[PDB]
Write a protein that binds this DNA or RNA. Structure first.
Lengths: 198, 32, 122, 130, 48
RNA sequence: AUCAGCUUGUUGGUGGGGUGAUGGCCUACCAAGGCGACGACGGGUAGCCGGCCUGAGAGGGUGACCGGCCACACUGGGACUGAGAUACGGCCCAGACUCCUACGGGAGGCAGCAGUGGGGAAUAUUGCACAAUGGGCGCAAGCCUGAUGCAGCGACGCCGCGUGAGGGAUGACGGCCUUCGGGUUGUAAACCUCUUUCAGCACAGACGAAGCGCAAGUGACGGUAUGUGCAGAAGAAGGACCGGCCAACUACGUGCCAGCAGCCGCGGUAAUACGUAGGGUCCGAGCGUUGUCCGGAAUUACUGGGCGUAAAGAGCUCGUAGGUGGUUUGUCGCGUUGUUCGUGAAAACUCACAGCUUAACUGUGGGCGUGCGGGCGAUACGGGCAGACUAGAGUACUGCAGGGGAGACUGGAAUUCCUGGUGUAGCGGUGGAAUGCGCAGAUAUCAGGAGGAACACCGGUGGCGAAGGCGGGUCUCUGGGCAGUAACUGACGCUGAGGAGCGAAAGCGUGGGGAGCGAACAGGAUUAGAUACCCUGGUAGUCCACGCCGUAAACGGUGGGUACUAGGUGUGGGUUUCCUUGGGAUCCGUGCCGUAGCUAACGCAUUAAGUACCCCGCCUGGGGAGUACGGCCGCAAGG
RNA sequence: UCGAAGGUGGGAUCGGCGAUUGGGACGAAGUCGUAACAAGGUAGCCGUACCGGAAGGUGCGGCUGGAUCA
């Protein structure tokens, strides 16, 4: 990924809507032996997302690096994924496993900061979280820890969803501090939203 | 798995057996 | 595993794995140097490495490496051996301090300057 | 047969994982109290106690959602024989951030984590379900 | 956290020989009555 | 436990003795215990703690300062004095050492504060005061105090401040790159105002003392801290690093050299990795290196790991301690839990506040002190005791299947030899041959005899056994399994550290037996050469009796038990409902395919590698090495 | 009576050195072969025994982590 700063007198750079947040995690040239030598190709693990908390995971195969990055962008574009939150935190401590990828995603009080390793830091920095506390146990990789983090975010659910599963009136599903954090986060959603209307 | 591990182990074992052939006598008498 | 099996006996750490046997848990030891011969490393790295084997005060017989361009030390110099690591010659894991009790600092060394012991230009 | 309740919750994880409608069990007192707690929190739908070969039996129907999806998202026996886990009042261990619940058998009977918090008594855990 | 069952072979003092093997005796701490006989037993509960 | 037994004042009793006090503390007698796989007795190392460091915590490391206990005072014994003794600057004795001696005999004791030598990578002055606080004696004054208070020394640590500020160009001199245009150093510099902490020189000069004192004075630190003045940018910056991780790049110089490096790895005349230069980055009175510890390391996994093939399931069972325990009524309150009392010194730690120009620092008030003991309460769960139950477990009864085992007797086909026929020159063997047996009568064929071993066909993805393993037949003795009824007992269950037993083949001992096969051992051939394959011969062995040994890819590479989790189709054992042998249902077994789920993947998949509980074994990078040393078993090989 | 040191005695146990010797690790490159990986040119491996300059070879039983398919 070099020589991107450019000014063209051509038709268009085609800049348009959906200015999302896009992170390229790792690139390892992938070789293939054929008759008389090696054929080098490229893999780019592409994370895309918006600051609401919708995450994509794309996996680009091409024999050029920006081609593989662009194919990962289109593949994560094809496949988004909804993550439920509280304010800008996570709901409750989970462990995700993608066959060797263990990631523990635990919430924290706000202000602490996204503390995670670089793959999980990528998937969570694209997402709508600002203050959680994760760790990547096992598998020491990028692909399995990204995919394990997304499986960990599939083990998430709303407080309300849990209440619904059990047919119980909330209050009765959460404890009270987390309901107060719901009041804080929806209150600042009201403040920034009504400042957004004017 | 592979048989290479098995064969390294067995090389050690063989060498040792031989070493006890040749020193058999000597170990008996030097020990007695 | 089967927690009563850990109540019986289990779960101890492995081994301290001591790095240097200079002695005493001491950072550098002065030493009488003998036979300052120059050696040949492993196969991807071919050169002549300027080692000297040193009898540390701690009574042990070791073999240290002399960093820098040349060594002021001849037979029977009082060199101050610290512990290091040189991959390249097997069994030599100690480095002689340059700019010390006997072995003078490296001359015209102008950039590295703390290692190799070169004093500042007047 | 070494742990009764592990076979109970084990049979609920298997019958929950394999999309079953009901499940049948050897009835006992402690399984009746756990079945009554999982009634009162709504993780199971309802249980009925039959007479059968020699003893009574516990037939639990499981509560599913708007399609085939499950309400009990897991069980885990923690106060297991061999490491029976005890809990003072300071912390009735919170489960799944509070969204899960903790079946805690205090001196007043069998309670949940929240009931062990407000009523001011602790003294066990048992399995906690989310 | 394993609740370990442990034993303790204390030594104890019967003046009247009221206890025998297998009994459920009480105990109470005393002055050091000899070299490790630091217990005397009152109100023996059950005999064998 | 590569240390399994130790102990004879040793274990208890009585009478004395001793002590401030209980007591094998001591003694006489009597009794003969006591302590140990919850590790006794031995070996190694070590002062212990409040704490400190690290860590999300759990934990790991450590025991410097400060504080609390303990032990010792040249080495080793002993008492005396005294309210109280390891009696550091006491005594007595014996040692080792230093010293004085008129040679008769004496003297010493820095592990007090300084200080010297030595050892060492390394650790300070032979300081000043009792003004303050503590201590002693004294009616008091007062005297003593290397405790203490302070000072000196070392960037040894932690914190604070300084080495100037503001202006200043289409950006000078110089430097080094360059695409030869220029670009960087660089607003930085020179210059122009301004301000001076801190060092400098002046003069003033403390608090610490609501103190002591009956004397009139008294502060070691100290003319220090600190004030108010004067002069002037005036006296004040360095060290590492710039391949990757990991903020930061260019040229020149050497071109597998000289060197670098924490790991990966850089040097073979165009190195952003070596050396020098510019330039950048990061820190800053410091900055790098080495050592030691925690972290990252979920890499000893309680929290928080594993064992089909990656390291890892004992060859297989039986069973001692141990761990663990179905249904249900009562009782106890040992585990658990609630509450209150006591305690966890101070300091530290954390929160707030106050004090020093700020901070480090210090103080005040909370919390912490995760614990332990006493009182009172609760009884679900665990446990104890006392009971009850029949589903687990075992027994009885009726059957049923089977190379389960041992002993005994016996059967035929085939190979070899033997005697006798019939009968001739080849047979045997090979990729092709030759050693070899023959021509003395072989191989071939017929009749008879000996002797040994193995059991064609049935017989296979089939049966039985715990695992090894088990197939000619019959008889004798004996072991287990399965189903059916439910007659009995009433939780008697599960696992099982050590332990005993069984355990292919090879091998070992003593005595038999010895047909075939056959290591070793010959010859032949092949080959460069065969100490090999292939050929001809061939001893131990293979066989039986009696014992050893204890190993295997002893493999399902899968410890044992239990409950549950879509199915489909074979086959083995047995019960029953229906058609009337055919299907159904059921309990036990063994295969092939297959969902869910699981796995690193292959795969597994109701006979789990799925979901859970109980107990055991075992793993912690590869070699070194299942080896040395030591012990145990063994006739030895060896385990 | 007890009793420190001293003396005599025979042992335990921890080490240091020892001529010679066994193996082990590394070295580049030397000599000798070619055992293993493809049916590796005789399928490989386990146990054990015997033999051989060496890798190894053979026997007895086992195993697929074996092959092509009579």
């Amino acid at each position: 990924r070099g020589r991107r700063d450019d000014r063209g007198g051509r038709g268009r750079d085609g800049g348009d809507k959906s200015n999302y947040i896009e992170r390229v995690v790792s690139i390892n040239r992938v070789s293939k032996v054929v008759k008389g030598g090696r054929r080098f190709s490229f893999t780019a693990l592409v994370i895309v997302g918006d600051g609401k908390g919708m995450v994509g995971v794309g996996y680009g195969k091409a024999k050029e690096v920006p081609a593989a990055i662009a194919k990962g962008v289109e593949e994560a574009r094809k496949n988004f994924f909804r993550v439920p939150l509280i304010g800008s935190t996570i709901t409750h401590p989970v462990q995700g496993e993608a066959a060797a990828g263990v990631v523990m995603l635990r919430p924290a009080s706000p202000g602490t900061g996204v503390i995670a390793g670089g793959a999980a830091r990528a998937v969570l920095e694209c997402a709508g979280v600002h203050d959680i506390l994760a760790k990547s146990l096992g598998s020491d990789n990028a692909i399995n820890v990204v995919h394990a983090t997304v499986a960990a975010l599939k083990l998430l659910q709303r407080p309300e969803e849990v209440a619904a599963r059990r047919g119980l009136p909330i209050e009765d599903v959460a404890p009270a501090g987390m309901l107060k954090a719901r009041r804080e986060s929806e209150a600042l959603a009201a403040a920034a939203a009504r400042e957004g209307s004017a | 798995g592979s048989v290479i591990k098995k064969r390294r182990k067995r090389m050690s074992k063989k060498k040792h057996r031989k070493l006890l052939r040749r020193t058999r006598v000597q170990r008996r008498k030097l020990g007695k | 595993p089967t927690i009563q099996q850990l109540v019986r006996k289990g779960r101890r750490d492995k081994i301290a794995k001591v790095k240097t046997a200079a002695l005493k848990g001491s950072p550098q030891r002065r030493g009488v140097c003998t036979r300052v011969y120059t050696t040949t490393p492993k196969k991807p790295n071919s050169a002549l490495r300027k080692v000297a084997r040193v009898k540390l005060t701690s009574q042990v017989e070791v073999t240290a490496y002399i960093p820098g361009e040349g060594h002021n030390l001849q037979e029977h110099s009082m060199v101050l051996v610290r512990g290091g690591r040189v991959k390249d010659l097997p069994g030599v894991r100690y480095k002689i301090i340059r700019g010390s009790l006997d072995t003078q600092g490296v001359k015209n060394r102008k950039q590295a300057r703390s290692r190799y012991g070169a004093k500042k230009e007047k | 047969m070494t742990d009764p309740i592990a076979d109970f919750l084990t049979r609920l994880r298997n019958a929950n994982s394999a999309y079953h409608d009901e499940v049948t069990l050897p009835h006992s007192k402690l399984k009746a109290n756990i079945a009554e707690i999982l009634k009162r929190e709504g993780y199971i739908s309802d249980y009925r106690t039959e007479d059968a070969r020699v003893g009574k039996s516990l037939v639990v129907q499981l509560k599913y959602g708007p399609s085939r999806e499950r309400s009990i998202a897991g069980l885990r026996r923690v106060s297991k024989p061999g490491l029976r886990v005890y809990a003072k009042s300071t912390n009735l261990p919170r489960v799944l951030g509070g969204l899960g619940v903790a079946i805690i058998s205090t001196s007043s009977g069998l309670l949940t984590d929240r009931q062990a918090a407000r009523q001011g008594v602790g003294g066990e855990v048992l399995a906690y379900v989310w | 956290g394993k609740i370990i069952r442990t034993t303790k072979k204390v030594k104890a003092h019967d003046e009247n020989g009221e206890a025998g093997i297998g009994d459920r005796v009480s105990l109470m701490e005393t002055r050091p009555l000899s070299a490790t006989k630091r217990w005397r037993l009152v109100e023996i509960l059950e005999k064998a």
